[PDB]
Amino acid sequence: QTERAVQQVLEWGRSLTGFADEHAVEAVRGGQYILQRIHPSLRGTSARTGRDPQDETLIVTFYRELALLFWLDDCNDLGLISPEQLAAVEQALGQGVPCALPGFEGCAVLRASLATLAYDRRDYAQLLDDTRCYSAALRAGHAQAVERWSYAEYLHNGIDSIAYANVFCCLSLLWGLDMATLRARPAFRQVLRLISAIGRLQNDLHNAVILLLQRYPAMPVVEFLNDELAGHTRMLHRVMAEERFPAPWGPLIEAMAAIRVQYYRTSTSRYRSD
Amino acid sequence: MIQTERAVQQVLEWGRSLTGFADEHAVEAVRGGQYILQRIHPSLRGTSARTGRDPQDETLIVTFYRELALLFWLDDCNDLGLISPEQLAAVEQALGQGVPCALPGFEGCAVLRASLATLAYDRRDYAQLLDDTRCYSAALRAGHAQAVAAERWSYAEYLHNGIDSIAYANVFCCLSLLWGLDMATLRARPAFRQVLRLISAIGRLQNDLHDNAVILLLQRYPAMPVVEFLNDELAGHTRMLHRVMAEERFPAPWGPLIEAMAAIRVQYYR
Numbered sequence A: 001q002t003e004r005a006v007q008q009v010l011e012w013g014r015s016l017t018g019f020a021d022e023h024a025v026e027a028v029r030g031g032q033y034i035l036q037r038i039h040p041s042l043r044g045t046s047a048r049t050g051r052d053p054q055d056e057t058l059i060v061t062f063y064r065e066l067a068l069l070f071w072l073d074d075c076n077d078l079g080l081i082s083p084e085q086l087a088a089v090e091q092a093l094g095q096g097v098p099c100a101l102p103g104f105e106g107c108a109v110l111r112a113s114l115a116t117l118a119y120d121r122r123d124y125a126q127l128l129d130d131t132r133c134y135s136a137a138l139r140a141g142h143a144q145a146v147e148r149w150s151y152a153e154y155l156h157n158g159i160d161s162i163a164y165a166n167v168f169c170c171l172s173l174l175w176g177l178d179m180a181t182l183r184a185r186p187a188f189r190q191v192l193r194l195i196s197a198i199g200r201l202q203n204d205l206h207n208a209v210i211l212l213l214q215r216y217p218a219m220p221v222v223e224f225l226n227d228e229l230a231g232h233t234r235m236l237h238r239v240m241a242e243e244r245f246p247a248p249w250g251p252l253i254e255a256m257a258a259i260r261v262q263y264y265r266t267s268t269s270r271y272r273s274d
Numbered sequence B: 001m002i003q004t005e006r007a008v009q010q011v012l013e014w015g016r017s018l019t020g021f022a023d024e025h026a027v028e029a030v031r032g033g034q035y036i037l038q039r040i041h042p043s044l045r046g047t048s049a050r051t052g053r054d055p056q057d058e059t060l061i062v063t064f065y066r067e068l069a070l071l072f073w074l075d076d077c078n079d080l081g082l083i084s085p086e087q088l089a090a091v092e093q094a095l096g097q098g099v100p101c102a103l104p105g106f107e108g109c110a111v112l113r114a115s116l117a118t119l120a121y122d123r124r125d126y127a128q129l130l131d132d133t134r135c136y137s138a139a140l141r142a143g144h145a146q147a148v149a150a151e152r153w154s155y156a157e158y159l160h161n162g163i164d165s166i167a168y169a170n171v172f173c174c175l176s177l178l179w180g181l182d183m184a185t186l187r188a189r190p191a192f193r194q195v196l197r198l199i200s201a202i203g204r205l206q207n208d209l210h211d212n213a214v215i216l217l218l219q220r221y222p223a224m225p226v227v228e229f230l231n232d233e234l235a236g237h238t239r240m241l242h243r244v245m246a247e248e249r250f251p252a253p254w255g256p257l258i259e260a261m262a263a264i265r266v267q268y269y270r
């Protein structure tokens, strides 16, 4: 049930300086969307793996990772914590060890849990790898407005900063979806890149838009970026029809394709009178 | 390393078994081919003891030029309609599956593919070449429909298609096949596949600036300074390319080879 999950995510978040109620709320809202969409496809691999779709311990863990990502994003974008603290935190999460600075016990707790629950431990090292990649991508995008990046470099970094690769890997880790052997597949790698680019753009259309408008003030940036979103969605579809991926990968990917951020992140923020 | 005109005649001798083949196809193929071989020659000298493949082996060289000539010819068949839709499909099936062409007039197809299979150092490169051929073929036609769509596609789709249509993957794969450059193993790396997409994107953007990116963007977003954008993009891909090449040091002759392609000008042969 929703509020039990939100509160367990929230409770863990108190061991993270800068954590906000919204980080836990956006996480459970997005996570629930993904888990229920893939539920039926997840029941079939359920006998094989023994990983039960409604395993409370697995759900809350998946939501915590999601909250972790939203939090890190804000930390990076809003200065919620200092740059020294962000470095110690990212360093810890990237190796799966406790943070060296006080106030971030949640890093040790979550990585320890992920290690323990890993179906195929190769997913755990991959998640650590994806975590380091995410951190660097967040850094890079930030250092980019403090000349400019090209649309191509932006999108290349954006694919890593949208963290869809981390989301999929955490799902594989908890429900034994064998992403570790699937990624060796060129076409799987290619759609993962497409789905991410779709995510980065869907979000920014709520930054690529500003980046472009500054470079080419006379360019119809919004129409363009909207055509790019349509384009990627079409390429994503073509490939989806020409490749067959074991359950629940097909649904998972399409589930990520439809999830608009309006269902998460930039919609959730604590209320104030104003 | 075999004289230029003799190589041209060698290529032309085979090209004559392909309907629509023109003298210019053989010439361009030898020109581009020589440019590439000259720039990776120091490396190939180094790997030749291990592989037994001589940088100057005339059989290897002409075969490489014949494949380039095949690619130039196919582009023209597609763009200028040198052969019928039916004939192009039959040719693309033969070259893409590695079997004889089912329609007459294209004997050169089965002949070239058979030599490549036979000459392959690592036969996985031959299978990869058939795959790249299918990708190239599909991209040439899809790209063709575009200047006739009324419903042009996104820049994303254009570049993705242009990466395949520029054929650098085919060139690299054909070189690996003939000189034993172990491309099938290097592809296991994520960073190698990435530089492959990058250098191809660079080739597509360069050829177009000099289905076409400019024409596409201009008539879709007419107020956008498309040429400014594209040049930025190209410098963008170039920076990314240098990055990866620097980080991972690919075995010889891949560095010199990728470098040579980033620098090659469609004007040096076309």
Ligand SMILES: O=P(O)(O)C(O)(Cc1cccc(-c2cccc3c2oc2ccccc23)c1)P(=O)(O)O
Pocket (backbone or CB within 6 Å): B032, B033, B036, B067, B068, B069, B071, B072, B073, B075, B140, B143, B165, B166, B167, B168, B171, B203, B204, B207, B208, B264, B266
């Ligand atoms: O498929 P498109 O017509 O879109 C294009 O990629 C062109 C092309 C036509 C014919 C052959 C090739 C290709 C094929 C074989 C060899 C070589 C090719 O490109 C180069 C460059 C340098 C050396 C050899 C080759 C590329 P373009 O960038 O010139 O439009």
